[PDB]
Amino acid sequence: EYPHNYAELLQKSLLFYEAQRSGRLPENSRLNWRGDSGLEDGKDVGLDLTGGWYDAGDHVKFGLPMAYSAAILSWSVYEYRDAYKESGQLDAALDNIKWATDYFLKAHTAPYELWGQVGNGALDHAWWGPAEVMPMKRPAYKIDAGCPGSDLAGGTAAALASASIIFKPTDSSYSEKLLAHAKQLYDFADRYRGKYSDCITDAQQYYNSWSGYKDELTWGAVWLYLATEEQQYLDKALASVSDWGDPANWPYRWTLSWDDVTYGAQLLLARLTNDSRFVKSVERNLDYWSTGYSHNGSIERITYTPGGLAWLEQWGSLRYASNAAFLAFVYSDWVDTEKAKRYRDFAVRQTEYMLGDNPQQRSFVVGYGKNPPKHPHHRTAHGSWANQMNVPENHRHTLYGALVGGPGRDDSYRDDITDYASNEVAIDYNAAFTGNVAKMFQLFGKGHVPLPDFPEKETPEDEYFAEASINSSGNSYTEIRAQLNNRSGWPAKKTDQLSFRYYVDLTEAVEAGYSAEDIKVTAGYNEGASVSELKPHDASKHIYYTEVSFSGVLIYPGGQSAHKKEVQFRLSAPDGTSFWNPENDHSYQGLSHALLKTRYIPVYDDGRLVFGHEP
Ligand SMILES: [Ca+2]
Ligand SMILES: [Ca+2]
Ligand SMILES: [Cl-]
Ligand code: NA
């Protein structure tokens, strides 16, 4: 069997959020395959909008699911702080939530203005490569008083308010700052009513506000109550519920998600009030998800796969079962009735399904457990240099901790980078899941310890190199074809100051009465390089080189044309001479007429040797 370690699992789930980081990364970052990215986010609107999380396997920063994810992560630290502490993961949980809330503070530039998206969906998704080298424009979009977004603003207010609670013990001034912004955002949500996707209309095609904003208005208010213990916010929360309509008709067949936070709001209000409206609605939902909801005369129950997974729909199936399990866990830690036992058992069984107890006999958490998914739908972890999903054929990097979309309604599943149902990853997928892992550690994790010095720095493959071949060679010249490659991935990096050197031995020239001045270096077919005349490398041994420089030419791992540039160059002794001998030339060794990588044409970036061997 797989020997589960819930401290390790929790550690890895938080490492997933570290892999999602946009912006300038700290020096002490645990992932050597992530570098600075999105550094111009907000420049088109004159703001520093850098930081935050990439949503999924893409690089749009979608505000509504980012707020949701930070809120739920904060919620689980609020409920299960001791589990985070004893598993060693509290510092990492706070540090990862702070990455999101720091971005919310930058996005909240004015009391009634909130930047809600960076990146355009079509522009971002049309290109398949690592975040560090994104070549497209990344526009920023906002809501404000003239074009509001009570769902986005309310959900971000909830994220800041919940975060303000969990940061207070270790950073009271940051806590106070989070809380002050949360009050402003909630006033924005309350006073200027509308769905954010009616204003940031790009979001309609990815994170449409299907449920509207009445749920976020309750959600933000109750979180502000929990964060201030001021009665006005509880009153506002309860008043906002009147817009939910007749309590007999409250929905119960969905679950907590980035779109519908009704299920979180009513659960929090049930604990605060014991009002039968919220208690009954919570239990209708969790009955429907677990044993079945009894109408007195019939039993209504969510679809279950034959393998035991509670199956809501085709996309992010595991995310939905995890979100339900988190509600079940939190409710079963509150309520005293038999429903506490039934919901707890449900939550454990669903969590055990996605950790390996399923017909596929495999974990659905990348880099954890038995036979985890190897091909999650994730641009930067895959690391294509060619703008193609099947190049390379395996991921360059391990996206530790990511919960994939998972099986279909018949437990079917395919570990395929293009299978979006199976292998999508996303910050909202991992948010409640992270809390469920904390609870699994509390319940079953005695003696579980996290992994030390983890993860190990990945050893890079060849990232910068020339492939070269011999065009022709005579007794007075050598002509070379070269393609200078940037296939970087540890981390991927844009390079516009790449160069290489081609080394020759001129001993036979000196013996014949000639010198380096008599060799002419010329370019033929050329995609933007300069080729120097010969320069000395070792004067005593008559070793010279030509410097071939693509200075000012952008080369980067983002497409078949983007990752390489070509130049053909010739080194010529005077016409009619016969001394020229390439066979003792350092950079000529092993070359054939077929283009092939060579370690003897060293490559430089801004003058720094980055690959290959000098003589
Ligand atoms: Ca909503
Ligand atoms: Ca020679
Ligand atoms: Cl290209
Ligand atoms: Na693989």
Write the secondary structure of 580-612 as one string of H (helix), E (strand) and C (coil). CCHHHCHHHCCCCCCCEECCCCCEEECCEEEEC
Cross-strand bridge partners of residue 536:
544
Cβ–Cβ under 8 Å, residues 379 and 402: no
Helices (H) and strands (E) in the chain, counts: 17, 16
Ligand minimally distant from the alpha carbon of residue 150: 1
Check the annotation: does 216 bind a ligand: yes
Ligand minimally distant from the alpha carbon of residue 397: 4
Give the torsion through C-alpha atoms of 420, 425, 427, 433, to 10 deg: 110
C-alpha separations of 396 from 56, 351, 434 in Å: 17, 28, 25
Please give the structure tokens belonging to residue 329: 């866990």
Going by C-alpha positions, the residue among 372, 365, 381 that lies closest to residue 31 is 381
Experimental method: X-ray
Told to judge if 415 belongs to the known catalytic residues of this protein, a careful annotator would answer yes
Check the annotation: does 538 bind a ligand: no
Ligand minimally distant from the alpha carbon of residue 415: 4
Check the annotation: does 416 bind a ligand: no
Residues listed for the chain = 615
- Burial of 597: CB neighbours in 10 Å, binned 0-12, 13-18, 19+: middle
Write the secondary structure of 99-153 as one string of H (helix), E (strand) and C (coil). HHHHHHHHHCCECCEEEEEECCHHHHHCCCCCHHHCCCCCCEEEEECCECCHHHH
Q: DSSP of 277-321, one letter per residue? A: HHHHHHHHHHHHHTT-EE-SS-EE---B-TTS-B---SSSHHHHH
Cβ–Cβ under 8 Å, residues 398 and 366: yes
Catalytic residue among 424, 428, 463, 605: 424
- CATH code at 464-611: 2.60.40.710
Check the annotation: does 419 bind a ligand: no
Measured in Å, residue 92 CA sits from the centre of ligand 3 at 38
| Residue where the block lists tokens 């199936």 | 317
Catalytic residue among 4, 108, 181, 377: 377
Told to judge if 108 belongs to the known catalytic residues of this protein, a careful annotator would answer no
Distance (Å, whole) CA 401 – CA 361: 18
- The answer to whether the Cα torsion of 527, 530, 536, 538 is positive or negative is negative
Provide the residue ranges of all domains of the chain, joining segments of one domain with +: 6-444, 464-611
Measured in Å, residue 528 CA sits from the centre of ligand 2 at 27
Check the annotation: does 489 bind a ligand: no
C-alpha separations of 23 from 37, 48, 325, 408, 430 in Å: 5, 10, 33, 35, 21
Q: Is 504 helix (H, G, I), strand (E, B) or coil?
A: strand
Distance (Å, whole) CA 350 – CA 355: 9
377 phi, psi to nearest 5 deg: -75, 85
Check the annotation: does 259 bind a ligand: yes
Q: Is 11 helix (H, G, I), strand (E, B) or coil?
A: helix
Going by C-alpha positions, the residue among 305, 134, 131, 158 that lies closest to residue 218 is 158
- Burial of 340: CB neighbours in 10 Å, binned 0-12, 13-18, 19+: middle
Measured in Å, residue 601 CA sits from the centre of ligand 3 at 24
Cβ–Cβ under 8 Å, residues 155 and 220: yes
Told to judge if 463 belongs to the known catalytic residues of this protein, a careful annotator would answer no
- CATH code at 6-444: 1.50.10.10
Cβ–Cβ under 8 Å, residues 24 and 389: no
Ligand minimally distant from the alpha carbon of residue 128: 3
| Residue where the block lists tokens 């509001």 | 148
